[PDB]
Amino acid sequence: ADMEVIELNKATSGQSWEVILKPPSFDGVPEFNRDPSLEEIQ
Amino acid sequence: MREIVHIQAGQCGNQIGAKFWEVISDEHGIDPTGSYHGDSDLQLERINVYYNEATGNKYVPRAILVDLEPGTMDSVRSGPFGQIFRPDNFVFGQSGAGNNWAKGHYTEGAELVDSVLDVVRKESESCDCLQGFQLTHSLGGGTGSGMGTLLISKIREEYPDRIMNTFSVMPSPKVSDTVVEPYNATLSVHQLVENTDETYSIDNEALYDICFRTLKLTTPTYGDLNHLVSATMSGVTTCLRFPGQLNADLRKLAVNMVPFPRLHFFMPGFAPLTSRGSQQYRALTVPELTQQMFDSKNMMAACDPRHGRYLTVAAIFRGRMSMKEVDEQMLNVQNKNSSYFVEWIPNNVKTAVCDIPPRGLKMSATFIGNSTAIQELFKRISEQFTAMFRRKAFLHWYTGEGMDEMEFTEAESNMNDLVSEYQQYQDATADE
Amino acid sequence: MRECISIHVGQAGVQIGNACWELYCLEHGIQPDGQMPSDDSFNTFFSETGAGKHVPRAVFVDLEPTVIDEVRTGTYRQLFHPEQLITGKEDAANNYARGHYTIGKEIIDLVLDRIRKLADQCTGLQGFLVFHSFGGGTGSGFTSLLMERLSVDYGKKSKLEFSIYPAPQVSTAVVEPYNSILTTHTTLEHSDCAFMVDNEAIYDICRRNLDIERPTYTNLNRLISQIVSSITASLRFDGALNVDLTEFQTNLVPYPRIHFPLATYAPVISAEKAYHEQLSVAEITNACFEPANQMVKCDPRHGKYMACCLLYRGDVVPKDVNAAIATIKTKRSIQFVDWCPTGFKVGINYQPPTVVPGGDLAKVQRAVCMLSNTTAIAEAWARLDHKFDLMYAKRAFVHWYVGEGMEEGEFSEAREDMAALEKDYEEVGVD
Ligand SMILES: Nc1nc2c(ncn2[C@@H]2O[C@H](COP(=O)(O)OP(=O)(O)OP(=O)(O)O)[C@@H](O)[C@H]2O)c(=O)[nH]1
Ligand SMILES: Nc1nc2c(ncn2[C@@H]2O[C@H](COP(=O)(O)OP(=O)(O)O)[C@@H](O)[C@H]2O)c(=O)[nH]1
Ligand SMILES: [Mg+2]
Numbered sequence: 001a002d003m004e005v006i007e008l009n010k011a012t013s014g015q016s017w018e019v020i021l022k023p024p025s026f027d028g029v030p031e032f033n034r035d036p037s038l039e040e041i042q
Numbered sequence: 043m044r045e046i047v048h049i050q051a052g053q054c055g056n057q058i059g060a061k062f063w064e065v066i067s068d069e070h071g072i073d074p075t076g077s078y079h080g081d082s083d084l085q086l087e088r089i090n091v092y093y094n095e096a097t098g099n100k101y102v103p104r105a106i107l108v109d110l111e112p113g114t115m116d117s118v119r120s121g122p123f124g125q126i127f128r129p130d131n132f133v134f135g136q137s138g139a140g141n142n143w144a145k146g147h148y149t150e151g152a153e154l155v156d157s158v159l160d161v162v163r164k165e166s167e168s169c170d171c172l173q174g175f176q177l178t179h180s181l182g183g184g185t186g187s188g189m190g191t192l193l194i195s196k197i198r199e200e201y202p203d204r205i206m207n208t209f210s211v212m213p214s215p216k217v218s219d220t221v222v223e224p225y226n227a228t229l230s231v232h233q234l235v236e237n238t239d240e241t242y243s244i245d246n247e248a249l250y251d252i253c254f255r256t257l258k259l260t261t262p263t264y265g266d267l268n269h270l271v272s273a274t275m276s277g278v279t280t281c282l283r284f285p286g287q288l289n290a291d292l293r294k295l296a297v298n299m300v301p302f303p304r305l306h307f308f309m310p311g312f313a314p315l316t317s318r319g320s321q322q323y324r325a326l327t328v329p330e331l332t333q334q335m336f337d338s339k340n341m342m343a344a345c346d347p348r349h350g351r352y353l354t355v356a357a358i359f360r361g362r363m364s365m366k367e368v369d370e371q372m373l374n375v376q377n378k379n380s381s382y383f384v385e386w387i388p389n390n391v392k393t394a395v396c397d398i399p400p401r402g403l404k405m406s407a408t409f410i411g412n413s414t415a416i417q418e419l420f421k422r423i424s425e426q427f428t429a430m431f432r433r434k435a436f437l438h439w440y441t442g443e444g445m446d447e448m449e450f451t452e453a454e455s456n457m458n459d460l461v462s463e464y465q466q467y468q469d470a471t472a473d474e
Numbered sequence: 475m476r477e478c479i480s481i482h483v484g485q486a487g488v489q490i491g492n493a494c495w496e497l498y499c500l501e502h503g504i505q506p507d508g509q510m511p512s513d514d515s516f517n518t519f520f521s522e523t524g525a526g527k528h529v530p531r532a533v534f535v536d537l538e539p540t541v542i543d544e545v546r547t548g549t550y551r552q553l554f555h556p557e558q559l560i561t562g563k564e565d566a567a568n569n570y571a572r573g574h575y576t577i578g579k580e581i582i583d584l585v586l587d588r589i590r591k592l593a594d595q596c597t598g599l600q601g602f603l604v605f606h607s608f609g610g611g612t613g614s615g616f617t618s619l620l621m622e623r624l625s626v627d628y629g630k631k632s633k634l635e636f637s638i639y640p641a642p643q644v645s646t647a648v649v650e651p652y653n654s655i656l657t658t659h660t661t662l663e664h665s666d667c668a669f670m671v672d673n674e675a676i677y678d679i680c681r682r683n684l685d686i687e688r689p690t691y692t693n694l695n696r697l698i699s700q701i702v703s704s705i706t707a708s709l710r711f712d713g714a715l716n717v718d719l720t721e722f723q724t725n726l727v728p729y730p731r732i733h734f735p736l737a738t739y740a741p742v743i744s745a746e747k748a749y750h751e752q753l754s755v756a757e758i759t760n761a762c763f764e765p766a767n768q769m770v771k772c773d774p775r776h777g778k779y780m781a782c783c784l785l786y787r788g789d790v791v792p793k794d795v796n797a798a799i800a801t802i803k804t805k806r807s808i809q810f811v812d813w814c815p816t817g818f819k820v821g822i823n824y825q826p827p828t829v830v831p832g833g834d835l836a837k838v839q840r841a842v843c844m845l846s847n848t849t850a851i852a853e854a855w856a857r858l859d860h861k862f863d864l865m866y867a868k869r870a871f872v873h874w875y876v877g878e879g880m881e882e883g884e885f886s887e888a889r890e891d892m893a894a895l896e897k898d899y900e901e902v903g904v905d
């Protein structure tokens with residue numbers, strides 16, 4: 001029944017926001033998982 | 043990819059080639075003067091694949107007519123569409139090949155080859171984007187067979203990156219004009235395995251059997267056999283000469299049809315089977331057209347497709363029909379006949395539908411199969427060859443031209459390797 | 475000003491481009507000659523000439539001229555300047571090696587010179603949108619060659635793809651699995667975000683929802699164009715979500731390689747149908763979680779979400795949206811990975827979906843496009859990889875690529891990279 005929403009913007013044609021129903025379960029940034037140049041290509 | 047350069051070599055090559063040009067000219071609405079008199083924009087959309095546009099409304103076949111004998115050329119010029127051909131494109135010798143592969147490949151043929159290449163170069167340099175070459179010839183004769191394969195090798199040397207396609211007619215004892223046909227065929231097959239990208243194996247054994255057994259023609263003539271050849275040639279070239287998504291050019295056809303370089307010998311099929319006189323006929327629905335794909339009775343190569351497995355298949359449906367019905371019927375055949383398609387080449391059956399039916403029919407179907415069953419045709423030639431070669435019969439006709447026995451042994455061995463290669467993929471499993 | 479350059483490669487790319495640009499013109503009121511009798515955001519996609527004509531910021535490339543020749547003879551021949559429609563003579567013949575090496579190497583410098591001329595007209599170039607098929611030799615081979623060169627010339631500039639995943643119902647080559655794996659391997663490190671469009675999913679939507687017995691590319695592309703327009707509407711109109719190309723990446727891409735979002739669109743309604751009740755926000759939102767409305771065939775219930783974007787268009791109110799999301803959570807699990815919040819980023823763009831007059835799609839008051847990064851998309855890679863393996867075990871058709879200068883080792887490398895990609899989707903979903 002409870003939920004969180006985070007308002008972002010509003011414009012000529014827009015209005016966006018976040019929604020959170022079940023927050024991150026581990027806490028913190030993602031923890032799981034060249035070049036070239038022209039010479040390298042040729 | 044646009045222009046195809048067509049070459050016609052020998053008696054058979056010129057006879058079948060002339061019929062091809064009258065059949066396709068009629069489909070594209072071109073009369074014997076070169077003028078377009080049709081009433082459909084589809085007829086002209088890809089006209090440039092086979093015809094050069096000359097000054098004004100006229101269309102000229104991009105065809106080179108070759109023979110070591112003059113008579114056949116005269117017969118072509120005298121013909122219905124004989125006047126459509128470029129006069130400068132008739133290249134003929136005076137000294138024939140006498141149904142001797144050695145004369146066609148090494149002696150007389152070698153003397154005429156440069157005059158032919160000069161005409162093919164003229165046609166090729168005129169091209170915006172040459173796809174490659176299409177050769178019609180017999181394998182049982184001397185010119186079509188020996189000179190035809192010499193031309194393939196000389197053309198391959200100058201245009202190594204172009205597609206080399208042939209319509210090669212296989213000899214048969216049932217409709218034989220010479221006792222040495224097994225030698226001429228074996229020597230030619232050796233050349234084709236190495237030098238062509240795609241070969242349509244047109245078997246006189248199968249054409250005779252269709253005429254005699256199915257068309258009930260007691261004594262079949264070359265005219266009767268050629269009616270089946272021209273229907274097949276029209277069918278297999280449909281994708282190249284009309285707007286379409288599948289196999290629209292010689293290279294895309296080869297890429298879809300040839301999984302291994304040497305296995306480029308196709309078994310053509312056609313439905314419905316008709317005789318020159320039969321302008322009846324009242325028949326042929328979509329399920330009926332589809333069923334004749336596995337029908338050995340409808341094969342232009344004397345092989346039973348149920349004796350092997352299809353590596354790749356191209357099926358062309360012609361006439362006004364449901365694309366939904368075609369797709370359903372085609373899927374049904376693959377599901378019901380699972381065992382006759384290799385499991386290690388996914389979605390190996392490609393279908394195309396062309397609104398324009400061939401002449402005389404409202405509905406038709408053409409099949410192009412790369413089947414392991416084609417080994418039956420090569421086995422037949424090898425056994426006929428060995429029966430003669432074991433006793434060195436008629437060998438003096440070839441050694442007399444400067445040939446060595448080793449060439450015979452090599453050609454035979456290469457053809458038997460081809461048979462062994464087809465058998466290998468017939469027995470291969472998706473155990474992966 | 476934040477300009478976006480659109481690149482259309484091969485038949486699929488060019489034909490989808492025709493559908494997209496036709497739709498953009500209808501949305502912005504631009505006529506086929508570039509004239510408009512007039513928000514201002516459309517300038518990100520259309521430049522303006524001295525005569526008040528609006529020209530797409532796009533390049534159309536094909537190795538064969540047939541397809542593009544239709545654009546230069548067609549209704550929109552005046553929309554594009556001739557120099558932005560580039561064609562060769564010889565196609566890649568459904569061969570990645572021909573497209574990438576043999577034929578591609580001849581036209582690459584010319585294509586990049588045209589792209590450079592378009593980029594010179596930009597004050598704040600955001601990056602590129604690349605449309606191509608996986609299956610064709612140009613679509614596969616030329617695209618990966620171009621993507622590599624674009625990374626060199628346009629250092630840390632955003633590149634997004636609209637990739638046509640092959641389907642047997644509409645497939646033209648037996649070698650499409652080879653071309654698909656070769657292009658995916660080579661392009662992976664050069665693309666920021668790629669939206670795959672499975673031709674079978676589109677074929678089935680046209681058959682099921684639009685009652686088209688035998689869907690044509692024209693039918694498929696019109697539907698594709700609607701999804702592309704939904705993704706690009708917030709760049710071309712003053713939107714709030716996915717406002718710039720960098721925002722697509724930020725919102726949907728948690729790891730560099732896992733950059734393949736699943737698109738789901740609703741509603742898809744037949745035009746030749748009796749007047750019906752307009753769908754509510756709840757109804758269209760429910761439709762986003764139905765596998766039948768997906769752009770790629772796969773099962774999200776068997777996967778885990780890592781990001782979800784809901785892009786609404788037309789008569790939509792935030793209260794309606796939140797109520798719809800709340801009811802969905804009560805009935806559906808909607809499982810997210812441990813390290814991600816269970817949530818949605820929602821965007822509303824006020825313009826209702828525009829449809830092509832005489833088209834198969836009905837005009838609706840409101841529509842929605844959900845872009846979700848799910849591990850279930852790995853199922854699409856697995857299907858492709860298996861078909862590759864079947865043929866590759868026998869080296870079937872390999873000679874065609876080797877003959878063009880490719881090495882057999884490139885096939886092994888491409889397949890190993892795909893195995894690592896499948897492994898990445900598996901590792902990402904673990905906890
Ligand atoms: N959705 C969609 N798919 C298409 C279209 N045209 C081709 N395809 C698909 O793309 C694949 C064929 O590749 P193409 O784009 O036609 O070929 P190409 O890029 O021009 O490359 P080459 O012709 O080999 O030089 C198959 O999977 C087709 O189903 C189109 O207009 N729409
Ligand atoms: N189908 C068909 N086969 C032919 C025709 N003419 C000859 N043949 C066959 O071709 C072989 C003889 O070769 P031919 O082309 O006459 O000799 P060439 O002039 O030296 O090439 C034999 O297998 C004949 O049965 C023809 O018009 N049609
Ligand atoms: Mg193409």
